[PDB]
Design a protein around this ligand. Sequence first.
Ligand SMILES: *[C@@H]1O[C@H](CO)[C@@H](O)[C@H](O)[C@H]1NC(C)=O
Lengths: 49, 49
Amino acid sequence: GFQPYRVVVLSFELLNAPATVCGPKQSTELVKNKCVNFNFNGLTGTGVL
Amino acid sequence: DNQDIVYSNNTIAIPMNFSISVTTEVLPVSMTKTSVDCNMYICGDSTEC
Ligand SMILES: *[C@@H]1O[C@H](CO)[C@@H](O)[C@H](O)[C@H]1NC(C)=O
């Protein structure tokens, strides 16, 4: 309880601003005029593009 | 508007001419019929919910 510890605190904001830090997700060629479950920087959902 | 009419016990009023009037009366009958889908309102493109 008296030995030194190194503390790192990370703070981020989600899904309300343009983003520059993402995880390891491989992209996919996009298609239009069909309803598909999409993913735009973590924004999921199904709809017609 | 006031009329201040008086009472006479031996005098009667009798009309001497007549007219024909046309009046309008509008009544509602029906209202719009609406169907509500339970899902696609509480849910939609979401099989988890
Ligand atoms: C009743 O009224 C009509 C319409 O104004 C008029 O032409 C006619 O002379 C009147 N009749 C009498 C008996 O006053």
